[PDB]
């Protein structure tokens, strides 16, 4: 679990969105595994606007933050799960790191701010849904 709290937005994995998120919906995209809802309180996270390929992510199944090198956002085949059929997910970045299904939502960050959230993983792989192209998260 986990979310990004930037301005009056809450960014979560679409597959973990709550009823309150759907009832306060701003934007969602199944192909990216992202959903954004509106918040009453202002958040403290800031979004990175850069092309970093190194950063640090939070892994809840280890209670640890790990440094990682990650691929550029791209269209990656993701195996079938209880949340989606096997399909191509867009704007996904892969890295070597520990992950389990419940680690989705953990933040990936670089020197410029939040880069994305954990969205997939494998045997020693972790994948992150990028948010750096979502420029509207910085305003309204
Ligand atoms: C080969 C064994 N797999 C793992 O150890 C493992 C390790 C970490 C995660 C996963 N599951 C995973 O990526 N998703 C489940 C939730 C929905 C995600 C999506 N965005 O479509 C995809 C499997
Ligand atoms: Zn950066």
Swiss-Prot record:
Superkingdom of source: Viruses
Catalyzed reactions per annotation: Selective cleavage of Tyr-|-Gly bond in the picornavirus polyprotein
Residues the record marks as active site: 15 (for protease 2a activity), 33 (for protease 2a activity), 104 (for protease 2a activity)
Binding site for Zn(2+) 1: 50, 52, 110, 112
Coiled coil (residue ranges): none
Assembly behavior: Homodimer.
Function: Cysteine protease that cleaves viral polyprotein and specific host proteins. It is responsible for the autocatalytic cleavage between the P1 and P2 regions, which is the first cleavage occurring in the polyprotein. Also cleaves the host translation initiation factor EIF4G1, in order to shut down the capped cellular mRNA translation. Inhibits the host nucleus-cytoplasm protein and RNA trafficking by cleaving host members of the nuclear pores. Counteracts stress granule formation probably by antagonizing its assembly or promoting its dissassembly.
Protein's UniProt name: Protease 2A
Organism: Coxsackievirus A16 (strain G-10)
Interval of the full protein contained in this chain: 869 to 1008 of 2193
């Amino acid at each position: 679990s986990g979310a990004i709290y930037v301005g009056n937005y809450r960014v979560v994995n679409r597959h973990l969105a709550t009823h309150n998120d759907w009832a306060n919906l701003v934007w969602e995209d199944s192909s990216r595994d992202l959903l954004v809802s509106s918040t009453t309180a202002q958040g403290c996270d800031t979004i990175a606007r850069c092309d970093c390929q190194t950063g640090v992510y939070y892994c809840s199944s280890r209670r640890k933050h790990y440094p990682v090198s990650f691929s550029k956002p791209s269209l990656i085949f993701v195996e079938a799960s209880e949340y989606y059929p096997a399909r191509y997910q867009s704007h996904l970045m892969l890295a070597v790191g520990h992950s389990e299904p419940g680690d989705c939502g953990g933040i990936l960050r670089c020197q410029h701010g939040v880069v994305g959230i954990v969205s997939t993983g494998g045997n020693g792989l972790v994948g992150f849904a990028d948010v750096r192209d979502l420029l509207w998260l910085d305003e309204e």
